[PDB]
């Protein structure tokens, strides 16, 4: 119909041109309709409006996650009949900030050493390869797998890692699998943690699941299972998608990489520019109005859901001059790659650490290049978190 359906099917790094058109329109909030559910939704694409939305206490993230809320995703992201309320269930047990605690600066200082070791080990193995090699399979996959085992869940079997990864790729989708396959993904994940979370949390290590389980009524197995599913969904396809996308951005900008090779102290700024420039989610961050309000003049009624596309905001020319240029020296406002306000990614420091290690491993080795044109890269169509099927590269 004449109301836009959402999302915009921009599964590659080419952002849908619709986002810029909506940004330039006379509306600061645009009504859309969910393709997967038919629910009405509002969509924000301007940086200035997005700041107002994500800093407004009248907009609730948790209320937008509740069953029956208008939503963009085709299937509810919980096992049927369960809360799907992991952060609140941790808060209920007295686990104030266990998430941010176990992912903050002290955790980076524990893990950054082996993270950089592993990035170097992986890249050094690639430096010995002939012909074309795959940076997705042979760099991003082992690095992200080690990240999830060592920092989030505990030492996983290869079969366990393969299983959780498949559940993430199957359930976190707008399309490409059946309804039944999508629910079975969130079923199989929840069933998986109900049985194995206690054992995983009990092994020696610093992993977040152990911290959650071993912090001060006892922690129910349903809450520990909800925490496991939370860490997979929030930590696994995001890190793997982003690292793949960041590598593509670097390979597409050899002049920038040459600068980082010569001046490695500029890597942290390049990390921030990657977080702004490289797209990740194909949907949007969402919030529910808990009372009638106006945002930039547009009246929103209690119960309505307003979305912000982080990609659209990160490419807003009102915020970032030449927004479609990858400019590591950039000194613009804070990017939205980790969101904004109360729900700012609590994994942001760990993510920055793994991104930095990846950038350094690339910048240290001149000659790395994409083996084919960018438009020939194949993409997993329909994922919430963009990811190419492979990244063929050569020296």
Ligand X SMILES: CC[C@@H]1NC(=O)[C@H](Cc2c[nH]c3ccccc23)NC1=O
Residues 268-287: x where in contact with ligand X by CB under 6 A, - otherwise, as a string: ------------xx-xxxx-
- Picked from ligand HEM, ligand X, none, the partner binding residue 213 (CB below 5 to 8 A depending on kind) is none
Q: Which of 238, 239, 314, 358 binds ligand X (CB under 6 A)?
A: 238
Q: Which is nearer to ligand X, 90 or 370 (CB)?
A: 90
Least distance in Å: CB of 239 to ligand HEM? 5
Q: Does 355 bind ligand X (CB under 6 A)?
A: no
Q: Does 280 bind ligand HEM (CB under 6 A)?
A: yes
Q: Which stretch binds ligand X (CB under 6 A): 32-40, 70-78, 262-270, 318-326?
A: 70-78
Least distance in Å: CB of 129 to ligand X? 31
DSSP annotation string for 213-260: HT---PPPHHHHHHHHHHHHHHHHHHHHHHHHHHHHHHHT-HHHHHHH
Q: Which is nearer to ligand X, 133 or 193 (CB)?
A: 193
Q: Which is nearer to ligand X, 33 or 77 (CB)?
A: 77
Q: Which of 30, 51, 209, 233 binds ligand X (CB under 6 A)?
A: 233
Q: Does 351 bind ligand HEM (CB under 6 A)?
A: yes
Q: Does 228 bind ligand HEM (CB under 6 A)?
A: no
Q: Which long-range contacts (CB under 8 A, 24 or more apart) does 208-217 make?
A: 208/98, 208/99, 208/102, 208/103, 208/151, 208/152, 208/153, 209/152, 209/153, 209/154, 210/154, 211/98, 211/101, 211/102, 212/90, 212/95, 212/98, 212/102, 215/94, 215/95, 215/98, 216/94, 217/93
Q: Which of 89, 168, 350, 362 binds ligand HEM (CB under 6 A)?
A: 350
Contact status, residue 297 vs residue 28, Cβ threshold 8 Å:
yes
How many Å apart are CA 143 and CA 131, to the nearest integer? Answer: 22
Least distance in Å: CB of 309 to ligand X? 8
Q: Which two tokens stand for residue 150?
A: 């060592």
Q: Does 238 bind ligand HEM (CB under 6 A)?
A: yes
**Residue of 380, 121, 388, 384 whose CA lies nearest to 251:** 388
Q: Does 337 bind ligand HEM (CB under 6 A)?
A: yes
Collect all residues with Cβ–Cβ distance below 8 Å to 66 and sequence separation of at least 6: 288
Q: Which of 276, 384, 386, 391 binds ligand X (CB under 6 A)?
A: 384
Q: Does 235 bind ligand HEM (CB under 6 A)?
A: yes
Q: Which of 234, 334, 371, 372 binds ligand HEM (CB under 6 A)?
A: 234
Q: 133 phi and psi, to 5 degrees?
A: -130, 165
- Picked from ligand HEM, ligand X, none, the partner binding residue 144 (CB below 5 to 8 A depending on kind) is none
Least distance in Å: CB of 348 to ligand HEM? 7
What is the length of the chain? Answer: 395
Q: Which stretch binds ligand HEM (CB under 6 A): 38-46, 174-182, 226-234, 376-384?
A: 226-234
**Residue of 277, 276, 340 whose CA lies nearest to 308:** 340
How many Å apart are CA 11 and CA 280, to the nearest integer? Answer: 9
- Picked from ligand HEM, ligand X, none, the partner binding residue 326 (CB below 5 to 8 A depending on kind) is none
Q: Does 338 bind ligand HEM (CB under 6 A)?
A: yes
Contact status, residue 33 vs residue 3, Cβ threshold 8 Å:
yes
Least distance in Å: CB of 45 to ligand HEM? 16
Collect all residues with Cβ–Cβ distance below 8 Å to 168 and sequence separation of at least 6: 185, 189, 232, 233, 236, 237
Burial tier of 381 (Cβ tally within 10 Å: 0-12, 13-18, 19+) = middle
Q: Does 63 bind ligand X (CB under 6 A)?
A: no
Collect all residues with Cβ–Cβ distance below 8 Å to 202 and sequence separation of at least 6: 210, 213
Q: Which is nearer to ligand X, 312 or 370 (CB)?
A: 312
Give the interface with ligand HEM as residue ranges (CB under 6 A).
61, 87, 99, 103, 152, 230-231, 234-235, 238-239, 242, 280, 285, 310, 337-339, 343, 345-347, 350-351
């Amino acid at each position: 119909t004449a109301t836009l359906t959402y999302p915009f099917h921009d599964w590659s790094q080419e952002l849908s041109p619709r986002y810029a058109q909506l940004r330039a329109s006379d509306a600061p909030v645009c009504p859309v309709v969910s393709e997967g559910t038919g629910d009405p939704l509002w969509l924000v694409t301007r940086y200035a409006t997005a700041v107002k939305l994500l800093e407004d206490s009248r907009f609730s993230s948790e209320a937008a996650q509740a069953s029956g809320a208008p939503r963009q995703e085709p299937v509810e992201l919980r096992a049927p009949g369960t809360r799907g309320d992991a952060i609140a269930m941790l808060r209920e047990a007295g686990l104030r900030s266990v998430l941010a605690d176990g992912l903050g600066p002290r955790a980076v200082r524990r893990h950054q050493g082996w993270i950089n070791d592993l990035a170097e080990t992986l890249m050094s193995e690639l430096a010995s390869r002939e012909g074309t090699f795959d940076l997705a399979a042979d760099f991003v996959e082992p690095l992200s797998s080690a990240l999830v085992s060592r920092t989030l869940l505990g030492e996983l079997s290869a079969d366990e890692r393969d299983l959780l990864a498949h559940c993430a790729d199957t359930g976190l989708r707008f399309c490409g699998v059946t309804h039944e396959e999508q629910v079975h993904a969130f079923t199989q994940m929840h069933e998986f943690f109900l049985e194995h979370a206690r054992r995983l949390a009990g092994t020696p290590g610093e992993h977040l699941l152990k911290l959650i389980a071993e912090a001060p009524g006892p922690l129910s197995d349903e809450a520990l299972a909800e925490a496991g599913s939370l860490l997979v969904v929030a930590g696994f396809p995001t890190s793997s998608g982003f690292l793949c996308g960041a590598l593509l951005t670097l390979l597409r900008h050899p002049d920038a990489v040459q600068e980082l090779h010569a001046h490695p102290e500029r890597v942290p700024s390049a990390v921030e520019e990657l977080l702004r420039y490289t797209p990740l989610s194909t949907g949007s961050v969402k919030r529910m109005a808990t009372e009638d309000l106006e945002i930039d003049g547009v009246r929103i009624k209690a119960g309505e859901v307003v979305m912000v596309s982080l990609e659209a905001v990160n490419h807003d020319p009102d915020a970032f001059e030449d927004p479609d240029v990858f400019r590591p020296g950039r000194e613009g406002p804070m990017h939205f790659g980790f969101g904004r306000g109360r729900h700012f990614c609590p994994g942001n420091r760990l993510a920055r650490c793994v991104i930095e290690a990846t950038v350094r491993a690339v910048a240290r080795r001149p000659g790395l290049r994409l083996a084919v044109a960018p438009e020939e890269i194949s993409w997993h169509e329909g994922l919430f978190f963009r990811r190419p099927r492979a990244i063929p590269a050569t020296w």
